[PDB]
Amino acid sequence: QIPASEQETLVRPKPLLLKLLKSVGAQKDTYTMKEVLFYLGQYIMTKRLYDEKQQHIVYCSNDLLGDLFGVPSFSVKEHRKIYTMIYRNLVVV
Ligand SMILES: CC(C)(C)NC(=O)C(c1c(C(=O)O)[nH]c2cc(Cl)ccc12)N(C=O)Cc1ccc(F)c(F)c1
C-alpha cells in the first residue's frame, strides 16, 4: 500500500516513459503519480501485456515497458516495487 500523500507527488516522466504515456492518450508532460499509474494500467491493457490466465502478472519482456522497468515480468500486487520501477523513469518536481 502507498500513502495517499505520495500518490499526489508531482512528476515529469523522462522521454521513453513520456512516449508510452502519450500513446495511451495522456497529453501532458507533468503528472501526479496516481495519474502515471492510471495511464500505465491503460497501456498494459491496450498492449495486452497482462496475463491472460489472470495470475496477477504482467509479461513485459520485449515491450517498451520491459525496457523501462528492466524486468521480463512483475506482480501487479507489489505496489512499492512498481512505484520504484516508475520512479527510476522520472524526475520529481
Ligand atoms: C491492466 C492490469 C494489469 C490488470 N492493471 C492492474 O492490475 C492494476 C494497475 C493500475 C490501475 O488500476 O490503475 N495501474 C497499473 C500500473 C501498472 Cl505498471 C501495473 C498495474 C496497474 N492494479 C489494479 O489494482 C494494480 C495496481 C494498482 C495501483 C498501483 F499503484 C499498482 F502498483 C498496482
Side-chain angles (χ1 to χ4, degrees), residues 1-18 20-21 23-26 28-33 35-47 49-76 78-93:
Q1 184 149 338
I2 306 300
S5 60
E6 177 169 4
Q7 305 193 34
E8 310 300 351
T9 306
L10 274 158
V11 297
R12 288 188 171 106
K14 296 175 181 189
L16 290 185
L17 178 55
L18 222 200
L20 93 68
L21 259 32
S23 72
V24 169
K28 59 201 194 172
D29 287 20
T30 301
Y31 302 80
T32 62
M33 281 292 288
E35 290 179 303
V36 171
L37 271 117
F38 171 75
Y39 291 111
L40 251 21
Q42 301 292 295
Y43 178 84
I44 290 163
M45 282 163 181
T46 296
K47 298 215 77 188
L49 307 175
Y50 183 67
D51 182 25
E52 193 166 52
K53 302 180 169 58
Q54 311 299 308
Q55 304 295 294
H56 309 282
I57 301 295
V58 171
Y59 295 112
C60 50
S61 69
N62 313 308
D63 184 271
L64 179 50
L65 184 61
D67 293 350
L68 293 187
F69 276 17
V71 297
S73 63
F74 62 93
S75 168
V76 305
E78 302 191 301
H79 291 19
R80 177 52 62 191
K81 290 192 182 165
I82 293 168
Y83 260 60
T84 299
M85 290 183 293
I86 294 167
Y87 278 135
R88 295 190 220 117
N89 290 98
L90 53 75
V91 25
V92 173
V93 181

Short mmCIF file of all heavy atoms in Angstrom, two decimals, residues 7-58, unseen atoms left out:
data_model
loop_
_atom_site.label_atom_id
_atom_site.label_comp_id
_atom_site.label_asym_id
_atom_site.label_seq_id
_atom_site.Cartn_x
_atom_site.Cartn_y
_atom_site.Cartn_z
N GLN A 7 0.87 9.48 -3.55
CA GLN A 7 0.17 9.32 -4.83
C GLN A 7 -0.05 10.66 -5.53
O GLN A 7 -0.18 10.71 -6.74
CB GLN A 7 -1.17 8.61 -4.62
CG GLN A 7 -1.02 7.27 -3.90
CD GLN A 7 -2.26 6.41 -3.96
OE1 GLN A 7 -2.99 6.42 -4.96
NE2 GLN A 7 -2.50 5.63 -2.91
N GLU A 8 -0.07 11.74 -4.75
CA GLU A 8 -0.24 13.08 -5.30
C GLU A 8 1.09 13.78 -5.64
O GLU A 8 1.08 14.92 -6.09
CB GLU A 8 -1.08 13.93 -4.34
CG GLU A 8 -2.41 13.26 -3.88
CD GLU A 8 -3.39 12.93 -5.03
OE1 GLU A 8 -3.16 13.35 -6.19
OE2 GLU A 8 -4.40 12.24 -4.77
N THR A 9 2.22 13.09 -5.47
CA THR A 9 3.54 13.62 -5.86
C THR A 9 3.55 14.02 -7.34
O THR A 9 3.17 13.23 -8.20
CB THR A 9 4.66 12.56 -5.67
OG1 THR A 9 4.66 12.06 -4.33
CG2 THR A 9 6.04 13.14 -6.00
N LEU A 10 4.01 15.25 -7.61
CA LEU A 10 4.15 15.77 -8.99
C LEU A 10 5.45 15.28 -9.64
O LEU A 10 6.53 15.41 -9.05
CB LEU A 10 4.11 17.30 -9.00
CG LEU A 10 2.71 17.92 -9.08
CD1 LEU A 10 2.72 19.36 -8.56
CD2 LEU A 10 2.17 17.86 -10.51
N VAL A 11 5.35 14.73 -10.85
CA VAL A 11 6.48 14.11 -11.54
C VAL A 11 6.55 14.44 -13.03
O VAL A 11 5.52 14.70 -13.68
CB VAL A 11 6.46 12.55 -11.40
CG1 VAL A 11 6.60 12.14 -9.95
CG2 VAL A 11 5.20 11.96 -12.02
N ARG A 12 7.76 14.41 -13.58
CA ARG A 12 7.99 14.62 -15.00
C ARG A 12 8.66 13.40 -15.61
O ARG A 12 9.85 13.18 -15.41
CB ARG A 12 8.84 15.87 -15.23
CG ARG A 12 8.08 17.16 -14.96
CD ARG A 12 8.87 18.40 -15.38
NE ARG A 12 8.04 19.61 -15.31
CZ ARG A 12 8.12 20.57 -14.38
NH1 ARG A 12 9.02 20.51 -13.40
NH2 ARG A 12 7.30 21.61 -14.44
N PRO A 13 7.90 12.59 -16.35
CA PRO A 13 8.49 11.41 -16.99
C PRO A 13 9.62 11.74 -17.96
O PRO A 13 9.55 12.73 -18.69
CB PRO A 13 7.31 10.80 -17.75
CG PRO A 13 6.13 11.21 -17.00
CD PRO A 13 6.43 12.60 -16.51
N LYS A 14 10.63 10.88 -17.96
CA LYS A 14 11.74 11.00 -18.90
C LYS A 14 11.24 10.59 -20.28
O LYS A 14 10.13 10.07 -20.39
CB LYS A 14 12.92 10.14 -18.44
CG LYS A 14 13.51 10.59 -17.12
CD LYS A 14 14.58 9.63 -16.67
CE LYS A 14 15.17 10.05 -15.34
NZ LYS A 14 16.36 9.21 -15.03
N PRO A 15 12.03 10.83 -21.35
CA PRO A 15 11.49 10.69 -22.71
C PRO A 15 10.76 9.38 -23.03
O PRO A 15 9.66 9.42 -23.59
CB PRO A 15 12.73 10.85 -23.58
CG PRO A 15 13.56 11.82 -22.82
CD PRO A 15 13.36 11.47 -21.37
N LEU A 16 11.34 8.24 -22.67
CA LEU A 16 10.74 6.94 -23.01
C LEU A 16 9.41 6.68 -22.29
O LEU A 16 8.44 6.27 -22.93
CB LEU A 16 11.73 5.79 -22.75
CG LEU A 16 12.95 5.69 -23.67
CD1 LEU A 16 13.75 4.44 -23.36
CD2 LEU A 16 12.54 5.71 -25.14
N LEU A 17 9.36 6.96 -20.99
CA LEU A 17 8.10 6.84 -20.26
C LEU A 17 7.06 7.83 -20.79
O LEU A 17 5.89 7.47 -20.91
CB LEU A 17 8.32 7.04 -18.75
CG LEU A 17 7.08 7.00 -17.84
CD1 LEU A 17 6.30 5.70 -18.02
CD2 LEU A 17 7.47 7.18 -16.39
N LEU A 18 7.48 9.05 -21.09
CA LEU A 18 6.59 10.06 -21.67
C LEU A 18 6.00 9.57 -23.00
O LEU A 18 4.80 9.69 -23.24
CB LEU A 18 7.34 11.39 -21.90
CG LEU A 18 6.61 12.69 -21.54
CD1 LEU A 18 7.26 13.86 -22.26
CD2 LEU A 18 5.13 12.65 -21.85
N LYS A 19 6.86 9.01 -23.84
CA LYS A 19 6.46 8.46 -25.14
C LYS A 19 5.30 7.47 -24.99
O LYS A 19 4.29 7.59 -25.68
CB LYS A 19 7.66 7.78 -25.83
CG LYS A 19 7.48 7.56 -27.33
CD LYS A 19 8.31 6.37 -27.86
CE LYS A 19 9.81 6.61 -27.74
N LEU A 20 5.42 6.51 -24.07
CA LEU A 20 4.40 5.46 -23.97
C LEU A 20 3.13 5.95 -23.27
O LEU A 20 2.04 5.46 -23.54
CB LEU A 20 4.99 4.17 -23.36
CG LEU A 20 4.96 3.80 -21.88
CD1 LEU A 20 3.55 3.53 -21.38
CD2 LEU A 20 5.84 2.58 -21.66
N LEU A 21 3.28 6.95 -22.39
CA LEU A 21 2.13 7.59 -21.74
C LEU A 21 1.26 8.34 -22.75
O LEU A 21 0.03 8.32 -22.64
CB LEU A 21 2.61 8.56 -20.65
CG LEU A 21 2.56 8.14 -19.17
CD1 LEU A 21 2.78 6.66 -18.97
CD2 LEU A 21 3.57 8.94 -18.37
N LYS A 22 1.90 8.99 -23.72
CA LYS A 22 1.18 9.76 -24.75
C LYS A 22 0.45 8.88 -25.77
O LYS A 22 -0.59 9.28 -26.30
CB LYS A 22 2.11 10.77 -25.43
CG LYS A 22 2.49 11.96 -24.54
CD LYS A 22 3.28 13.03 -25.28
N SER A 23 0.98 7.68 -26.04
CA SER A 23 0.30 6.71 -26.91
C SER A 23 -1.00 6.18 -26.29
O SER A 23 -1.89 5.71 -26.99
CB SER A 23 1.22 5.55 -27.24
OG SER A 23 1.41 4.72 -26.10
N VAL A 24 -1.10 6.27 -24.97
CA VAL A 24 -2.30 5.88 -24.23
C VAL A 24 -3.29 7.04 -24.10
O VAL A 24 -4.36 6.88 -23.50
CB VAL A 24 -1.90 5.34 -22.83
CG1 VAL A 24 -3.11 5.17 -21.92
CG2 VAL A 24 -1.16 4.03 -22.98
N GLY A 25 -2.94 8.20 -24.65
CA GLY A 25 -3.82 9.35 -24.63
C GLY A 25 -3.66 10.28 -23.45
O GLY A 25 -4.53 11.12 -23.20
N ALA A 26 -2.57 10.13 -22.71
CA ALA A 26 -2.10 11.19 -21.82
C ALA A 26 -1.48 12.22 -22.76
O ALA A 26 -0.72 11.87 -23.65
CB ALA A 26 -1.08 10.66 -20.83
N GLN A 27 -1.82 13.49 -22.59
CA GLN A 27 -1.34 14.53 -23.50
C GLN A 27 -0.20 15.33 -22.88
O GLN A 27 0.64 15.88 -23.61
CB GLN A 27 -2.49 15.45 -23.90
N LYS A 28 -0.14 15.36 -21.55
CA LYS A 28 0.67 16.32 -20.81
C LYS A 28 2.06 15.81 -20.42
O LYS A 28 2.39 14.65 -20.64
CB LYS A 28 -0.10 16.83 -19.58
CG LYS A 28 -0.53 15.79 -18.56
CD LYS A 28 -1.68 16.35 -17.74
CE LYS A 28 -1.95 15.53 -16.50
NZ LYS A 28 -2.95 16.23 -15.64
N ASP A 29 2.87 16.72 -19.87
CA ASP A 29 4.26 16.42 -19.52
C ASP A 29 4.49 16.28 -18.01
O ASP A 29 5.51 15.72 -17.60
CB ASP A 29 5.19 17.50 -20.09
CG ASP A 29 5.37 17.39 -21.61
OD1 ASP A 29 4.53 16.76 -22.29
OD2 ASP A 29 6.37 17.95 -22.12
N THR A 30 3.56 16.80 -17.21
CA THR A 30 3.65 16.75 -15.75
C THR A 30 2.41 16.08 -15.14
O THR A 30 1.29 16.47 -15.46
CB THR A 30 3.80 18.16 -15.18
OG1 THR A 30 4.98 18.75 -15.73
CG2 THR A 30 3.90 18.14 -13.66
N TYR A 31 2.63 15.11 -14.25
CA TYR A 31 1.57 14.26 -13.71
C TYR A 31 1.70 14.11 -12.21
O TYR A 31 2.75 14.37 -11.65
CB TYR A 31 1.68 12.85 -14.31
CG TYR A 31 1.59 12.79 -15.82
CD1 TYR A 31 2.70 13.08 -16.61
CD2 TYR A 31 0.41 12.44 -16.45
CE1 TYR A 31 2.63 13.03 -17.99
CE2 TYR A 31 0.32 12.38 -17.83
CZ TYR A 31 1.43 12.68 -18.60
OH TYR A 31 1.35 12.62 -19.97
N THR A 32 0.62 13.67 -11.57
CA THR A 32 0.72 13.08 -10.24
C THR A 32 1.06 11.61 -10.45
O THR A 32 0.82 11.06 -11.52
CB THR A 32 -0.59 13.18 -9.43
OG1 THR A 32 -1.63 12.48 -10.10
CG2 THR A 32 -1.00 14.64 -9.24
N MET A 33 1.63 10.96 -9.43
CA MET A 33 1.94 9.54 -9.54
C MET A 33 0.67 8.72 -9.80
O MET A 33 0.68 7.79 -10.59
CB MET A 33 2.67 9.03 -8.30
CG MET A 33 4.14 9.38 -8.29
SD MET A 33 5.08 8.53 -9.55
CE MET A 33 5.11 6.85 -8.92
N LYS A 34 -0.43 9.10 -9.14
CA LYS A 34 -1.72 8.46 -9.36
C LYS A 34 -2.11 8.45 -10.84
O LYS A 34 -2.65 7.45 -11.34
CB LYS A 34 -2.81 9.15 -8.53
CG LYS A 34 -4.20 8.59 -8.78
N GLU A 35 -1.86 9.55 -11.53
CA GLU A 35 -2.12 9.66 -12.96
C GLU A 35 -1.19 8.78 -13.77
O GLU A 35 -1.62 8.12 -14.70
CB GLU A 35 -1.99 11.09 -13.44
CG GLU A 35 -3.08 12.04 -12.95
CD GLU A 35 -2.85 13.44 -13.47
OE1 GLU A 35 -1.78 14.00 -13.21
OE2 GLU A 35 -3.75 13.98 -14.15
N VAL A 36 0.10 8.77 -13.42
CA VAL A 36 1.05 7.91 -14.14
C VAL A 36 0.62 6.44 -14.05
O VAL A 36 0.66 5.70 -15.03
CB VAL A 36 2.50 8.08 -13.62
CG1 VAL A 36 3.41 7.02 -14.25
CG2 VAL A 36 3.03 9.47 -13.93
N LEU A 37 0.22 6.03 -12.85
CA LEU A 37 -0.21 4.65 -12.65
C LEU A 37 -1.49 4.31 -13.38
O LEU A 37 -1.60 3.22 -13.93
CB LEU A 37 -0.29 4.32 -11.17
CG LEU A 37 1.11 3.82 -10.80
CD1 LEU A 37 1.79 4.70 -9.78
CD2 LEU A 37 1.09 2.36 -10.39
N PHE A 38 -2.44 5.24 -13.43
CA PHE A 38 -3.65 5.03 -14.23
C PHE A 38 -3.30 4.75 -15.68
O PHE A 38 -3.71 3.73 -16.24
CB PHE A 38 -4.61 6.22 -14.13
CG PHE A 38 -5.76 6.14 -15.09
CD1 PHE A 38 -6.82 5.26 -14.85
CD2 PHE A 38 -5.78 6.90 -16.25
CE1 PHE A 38 -7.88 5.16 -15.74
CE2 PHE A 38 -6.84 6.80 -17.15
CZ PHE A 38 -7.89 5.94 -16.89
N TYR A 39 -2.52 5.65 -16.29
CA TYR A 39 -2.18 5.54 -17.71
C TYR A 39 -1.29 4.34 -18.03
O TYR A 39 -1.40 3.78 -19.11
CB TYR A 39 -1.58 6.84 -18.23
CG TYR A 39 -2.58 7.99 -18.29
CD1 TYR A 39 -2.47 9.08 -17.44
CD2 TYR A 39 -3.64 7.97 -19.19
CE1 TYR A 39 -3.39 10.13 -17.47
CE2 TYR A 39 -4.57 9.00 -19.24
CZ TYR A 39 -4.44 10.08 -18.38
OH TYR A 39 -5.35 11.11 -18.42
N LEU A 40 -0.42 3.95 -17.10
CA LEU A 40 0.36 2.71 -17.26
C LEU A 40 -0.55 1.47 -17.31
O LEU A 40 -0.33 0.56 -18.12
CB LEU A 40 1.40 2.56 -16.13
CG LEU A 40 2.89 2.74 -16.43
CD1 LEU A 40 3.14 3.53 -17.69
CD2 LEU A 40 3.64 3.34 -15.23
N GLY A 41 -1.56 1.45 -16.45
CA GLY A 41 -2.56 0.39 -16.46
C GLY A 41 -3.30 0.34 -17.78
O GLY A 41 -3.57 -0.74 -18.30
N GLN A 42 -3.61 1.51 -18.34
CA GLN A 42 -4.31 1.60 -19.62
C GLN A 42 -3.40 1.16 -20.76
O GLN A 42 -3.85 0.52 -21.70
CB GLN A 42 -4.86 3.02 -19.85
CG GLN A 42 -5.85 3.50 -18.77
CD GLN A 42 -7.18 2.75 -18.77
OE1 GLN A 42 -7.93 2.82 -19.74
NE2 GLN A 42 -7.48 2.03 -17.68
N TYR A 43 -2.11 1.48 -20.67
CA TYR A 43 -1.12 0.98 -21.63
C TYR A 43 -1.04 -0.55 -21.64
O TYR A 43 -1.05 -1.18 -22.70
CB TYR A 43 0.27 1.54 -21.31
CG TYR A 43 1.36 1.05 -22.22
CD1 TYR A 43 1.59 1.66 -23.45
CD2 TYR A 43 2.16 -0.03 -21.86
CE1 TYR A 43 2.60 1.20 -24.29
CE2 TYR A 43 3.16 -0.49 -22.69
CZ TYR A 43 3.39 0.13 -23.90
OH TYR A 43 4.38 -0.33 -24.73
N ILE A 44 -0.94 -1.14 -20.45
CA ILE A 44 -0.84 -2.59 -20.30
C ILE A 44 -2.04 -3.27 -20.94
O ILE A 44 -1.90 -4.29 -21.61
CB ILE A 44 -0.70 -2.99 -18.80
CG1 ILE A 44 0.68 -2.57 -18.27
CG2 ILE A 44 -0.89 -4.49 -18.60
CD1 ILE A 44 0.79 -2.54 -16.76
N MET A 45 -3.22 -2.69 -20.74
CA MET A 45 -4.45 -3.20 -21.36
C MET A 45 -4.40 -3.11 -22.87
O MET A 45 -4.61 -4.11 -23.57
CB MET A 45 -5.66 -2.44 -20.84
CG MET A 45 -6.09 -2.88 -19.48
SD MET A 45 -7.18 -1.67 -18.72
CE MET A 45 -7.50 -2.45 -17.13
N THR A 46 -4.10 -1.93 -23.38
CA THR A 46 -4.02 -1.71 -24.82
C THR A 46 -3.08 -2.70 -25.50
O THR A 46 -3.39 -3.23 -26.56
CB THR A 46 -3.58 -0.27 -25.15
OG1 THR A 46 -4.56 0.66 -24.68
CG2 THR A 46 -3.41 -0.09 -26.65
N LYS A 47 -1.93 -2.95 -24.88
CA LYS A 47 -0.92 -3.82 -25.48
C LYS A 47 -1.06 -5.29 -25.09
O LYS A 47 -0.27 -6.13 -25.53
CB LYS A 47 0.47 -3.29 -25.16
CG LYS A 47 0.69 -1.90 -25.76
CD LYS A 47 2.10 -1.71 -26.22
CE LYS A 47 2.39 -2.38 -27.54
NZ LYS A 47 3.85 -2.31 -27.83
N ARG A 48 -2.08 -5.60 -24.29
CA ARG A 48 -2.40 -6.96 -23.86
C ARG A 48 -1.23 -7.64 -23.16
O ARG A 48 -0.91 -8.80 -23.43
CB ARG A 48 -2.90 -7.80 -25.05
CG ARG A 48 -4.07 -7.15 -25.79
CD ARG A 48 -5.07 -8.17 -26.34
NE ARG A 48 -4.50 -9.05 -27.34
N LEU A 49 -0.59 -6.90 -22.24
CA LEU A 49 0.57 -7.40 -21.51
C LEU A 49 0.19 -8.11 -20.21
O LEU A 49 1.00 -8.84 -19.64
CB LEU A 49 1.55 -6.26 -21.20
CG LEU A 49 1.99 -5.42 -22.40
CD1 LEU A 49 2.87 -4.25 -21.96
CD2 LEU A 49 2.72 -6.29 -23.42
N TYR A 50 -1.04 -7.91 -19.72
CA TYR A 50 -1.49 -8.65 -18.54
C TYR A 50 -1.75 -10.12 -18.87
O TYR A 50 -2.28 -10.45 -19.93
CB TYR A 50 -2.74 -8.01 -17.90
CG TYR A 50 -3.16 -8.74 -16.64
CD1 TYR A 50 -2.35 -8.72 -15.51
CD2 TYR A 50 -4.35 -9.46 -16.59
CE1 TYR A 50 -2.71 -9.41 -14.36
CE2 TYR A 50 -4.72 -10.15 -15.44
CZ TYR A 50 -3.90 -10.12 -14.33
OH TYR A 50 -4.26 -10.80 -13.19
N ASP A 51 -1.37 -11.00 -17.95
CA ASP A 51 -1.55 -12.46 -18.08
C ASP A 51 -3.00 -12.84 -18.43
O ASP A 51 -3.93 -12.56 -17.68
CB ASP A 51 -1.15 -13.13 -16.77
CG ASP A 51 -1.25 -14.65 -16.82
OD1 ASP A 51 -1.18 -15.26 -17.92
OD2 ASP A 51 -1.38 -15.24 -15.73
N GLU A 52 -3.17 -13.48 -19.57
CA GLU A 52 -4.48 -13.97 -19.98
C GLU A 52 -5.06 -14.98 -19.00
O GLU A 52 -6.28 -15.17 -18.93
CB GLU A 52 -4.35 -14.59 -21.36
CG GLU A 52 -5.65 -14.87 -22.06
CD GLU A 52 -5.43 -15.17 -23.52
OE1 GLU A 52 -4.59 -16.05 -23.84
OE2 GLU A 52 -6.09 -14.51 -24.35
N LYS A 53 -4.19 -15.66 -18.25
CA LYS A 53 -4.59 -16.66 -17.26
C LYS A 53 -4.82 -16.06 -15.87
O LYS A 53 -4.98 -16.80 -14.90
CB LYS A 53 -3.55 -17.78 -17.16
CG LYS A 53 -3.29 -18.52 -18.45
CD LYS A 53 -2.24 -19.61 -18.27
CE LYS A 53 -2.16 -20.51 -19.48
NZ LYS A 53 -1.85 -19.74 -20.70
N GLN A 54 -4.80 -14.73 -15.78
CA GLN A 54 -5.30 -14.00 -14.61
C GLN A 54 -4.50 -14.24 -13.31
O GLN A 54 -5.04 -14.17 -12.21
CB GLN A 54 -6.79 -14.32 -14.38
CG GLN A 54 -7.67 -14.20 -15.62
CD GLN A 54 -7.68 -12.79 -16.20
OE1 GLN A 54 -7.93 -11.81 -15.49
NE2 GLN A 54 -7.40 -12.68 -17.49
N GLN A 55 -3.20 -14.50 -13.44
CA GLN A 55 -2.37 -14.84 -12.29
C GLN A 55 -1.62 -13.63 -11.73
O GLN A 55 -0.60 -13.79 -11.09
CB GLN A 55 -1.40 -15.97 -12.68
CG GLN A 55 -2.08 -17.20 -13.23
CD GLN A 55 -2.96 -17.89 -12.21
OE1 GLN A 55 -2.48 -18.42 -11.20
NE2 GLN A 55 -4.27 -17.88 -12.45
N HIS A 56 -2.16 -12.42 -11.95
CA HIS A 56 -1.64 -11.19 -11.33
C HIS A 56 -0.20 -10.86 -11.73
O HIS A 56 0.57 -10.29 -10.94
CB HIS A 56 -1.79 -11.26 -9.80
CG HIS A 56 -3.17 -11.62 -9.36
ND1 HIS A 56 -4.21 -10.72 -9.35
CD2 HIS A 56 -3.69 -12.80 -8.93
CE1 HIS A 56 -5.31 -11.32 -8.93
NE2 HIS A 56 -5.02 -12.58 -8.67
N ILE A 57 0.16 -11.22 -12.96
CA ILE A 57 1.47 -10.97 -13.54
C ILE A 57 1.33 -10.24 -14.87
O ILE A 57 0.47 -10.59 -15.69
CB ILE A 57 2.23 -12.30 -13.81
CG1 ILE A 57 2.41 -13.08 -12.51
CG2 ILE A 57 3.60 -12.03 -14.44
CD1 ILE A 57 3.31 -12.41 -11.48
N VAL A 58 2.18 -9.23 -15.07
CA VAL A 58 2.33 -8.55 -16.35
C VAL A 58 3.60 -9.08 -17.03
O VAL A 58 4.68 -9.06 -16.44
CB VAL A 58 2.46 -7.03 -16.15
CG1 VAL A 58 2.84 -6.31 -17.45
CG2 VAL A 58 1.17 -6.47 -15.57
#
